């Protein structure tokens, strides 16, 4: 079937430049669709950026004045969004989608990615295990869960069990302080299941290349 | 640049019943082709805008037949019939018609559903955490209802209220239910020179709060 996706640095020191890929595959952009770029700010608010249409046609917002390109590379399927001299406002997550002449976009839309604009440095995240105290009421439920702690920018990817654990997860937004941002994630399971099974959480900092596997185990 | 205006939030709506979402635009979206370029999007937590209506009252492909709707040239309504659980999240008109391009500010959807009170844990700092000289104390009240919520924490019996962050989450997919992570944060040493730690939650599914403790 069709699908975009998304790719780009995470993060952007103001003043600099802004370049995001959107690869398209089981589709080909020579078509004479909007090959578009939306964005969505901190509070969810959407603005439409552009788009690109039939190999060589595009369009652009005009409050995005002169500090934005959209092109393709046909050889590669891929088209891309540039932003010139970005500032702190530019904050955002950044989609690509295929629109058509009526508006319809079907589920021809990327996952989105995170971009931050910052003069923060990059910093990879300490994972801890949350294990509980002592044993609880016998033949019931148990909850754990891992702590995200000290990372810069957003955003973290957390799974359990490489995601075969995906039921009775919460995953709670991160709390920024001191340019450092910590999330929280538990996780319910029988108290039989554990620790009789392993439970493992999974963390990647994309912004880092760093990635961690914490074990939880009973105290 | 044309503007659309949409109420931030909806009355809270019962798992059953039908509720009705409205878009306003500053200008007329009826083209001279006679279609009115309006589209309807709903987005989930964490999830990518998804296409509902386009042409102000075609469904798109895979689209639940629950959804519909209609509209003149500047009021336009999407009526989401027997909501379920899964429709929470927030709901976007978008006009097509003249450029730039423009969005509503969104309507986030608001389910409605009995009292139930929190299930609390507390953490204590892992050993981990403690090599490096700080100590956070975690407590996870998970599934109330409804959102409003009160926690705090006591050291050896006394108020602490530094050193506290707290976390919520979205309106629950599958039960309508909230959730929230209240961490307190001090120095190892700190950690040290204490022994009783608690995390008490105020809820209106009860008189007397929920607690949960641990002895250092
Ligand atoms: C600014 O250009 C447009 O809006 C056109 C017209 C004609 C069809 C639909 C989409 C096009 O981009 N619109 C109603
Ligand atoms: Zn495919
Ligand atoms: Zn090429
Ligand atoms: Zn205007
Ligand atoms: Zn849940
Ligand atoms: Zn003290």
């Known amino acids: 079937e069709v699908k975009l996706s998304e790719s780009g640095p995470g993060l952007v020191k103001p003043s600099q430049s802004l370049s995001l890929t959107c690869t398209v595959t089981?589709?080909?952009?020579?078509?004479?669709?909007?090959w578009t770029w939306i964005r969505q700010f901190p509070g969810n608010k959407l603005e439409w950026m552009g788009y690109?249409?039939?190999?060589?046609?595009?369009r652009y917002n005009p409050s995005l004045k002169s500090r934005i390109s959209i092109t393709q590379d046909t050889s590669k399927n891929q088209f891309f969004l540039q932003l010139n001299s970005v500032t702190t406002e530019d904050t955002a997550t950044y989609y690509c989608?295929?629109?058509?002449?009526?508006?319809?976009?079907?589920?021809?839309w990327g996952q989105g990615t995170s971009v931050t604009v910052s003069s923060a440095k990059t910093t990879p995240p300490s994972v801890y295990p949350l294990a509980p105290g002592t044993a609880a009421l016998k033949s019931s439920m148990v909850t754990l869960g891992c702590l995200v702690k000290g990372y810069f920018p957003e955003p973290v990817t957390v799974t359990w069990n490489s995601g075969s654990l995906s039921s009775g997860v919460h995953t709670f937004p991160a709390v920024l302080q001191s340019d450092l941002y910590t999330l929280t994630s538990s996780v319910t399971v029988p108290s039989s299941t554990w620790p009789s099974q392993t439970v493992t959480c999974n963390v990647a900092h994309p912004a880092s290349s760093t990635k961690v596997d914490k074990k939880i185990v009973p105290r | 640049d044309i503007v659309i205006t949409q109420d931030e939030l909806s009355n809270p709506v019962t798992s059953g019943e039908s509720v009705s979402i409205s878009c306003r635009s500053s200008?007329?979206?009826?083209?001279?082709?006679?279609?009115?370029?309006l589209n309807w999007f709903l987005q989930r937590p964490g999830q990518s805008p998804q296409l509902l209506i386009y042409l102000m009252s075609t469904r798109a492909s895979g689209v639940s037949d629950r959804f519909s709707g209609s509209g003149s040239g500047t009021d336009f309504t999407l009526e989401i019939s027997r909501v379920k659980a899964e429709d929470v999240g927030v709901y976007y008109c978008?006009?097509?018609?003249?450029?730039?391009?423009?969005f509503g500010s969104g309507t986030k959807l608001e389910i409605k559903r009995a009292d139930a009170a929190p299930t609390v844990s507390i953490f204590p700092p892992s050993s981990e955490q403690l090599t490096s000289g700080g100590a956070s104390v975690v407590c996870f009240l998970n599934n109330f209802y409804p959102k409003d919520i009160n926690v705090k924490w006591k050291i050896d019996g006394s108020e602490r209220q530094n050193g506290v962050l707290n976390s919520w989450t979205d309106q629950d997919s599958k039960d309508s239910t909230y959730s929230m992570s209240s961490t307190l944060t001090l120095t190892k040493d700190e950690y040290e020179r204490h022994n009783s730690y608690t995390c008490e939650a105020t809820h209106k599914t009860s008189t007397s709060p929920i607690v949960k403790s641990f002895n250092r």
């Open positions: 978008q006009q097509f018609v003249e450029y730039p391009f423009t």
């Open positions: 989608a295929r629109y058509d002449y009526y508006g319809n976009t079907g589920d021809y």
């Open positions: 690109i249409r039939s190999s060589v046609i595009t």
């Open positions: 200008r007329s979206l009826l083209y001279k082709d006679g279609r009115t370029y």
């Open positions: 089981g589709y080909s952009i020579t078509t004479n669709y909007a």
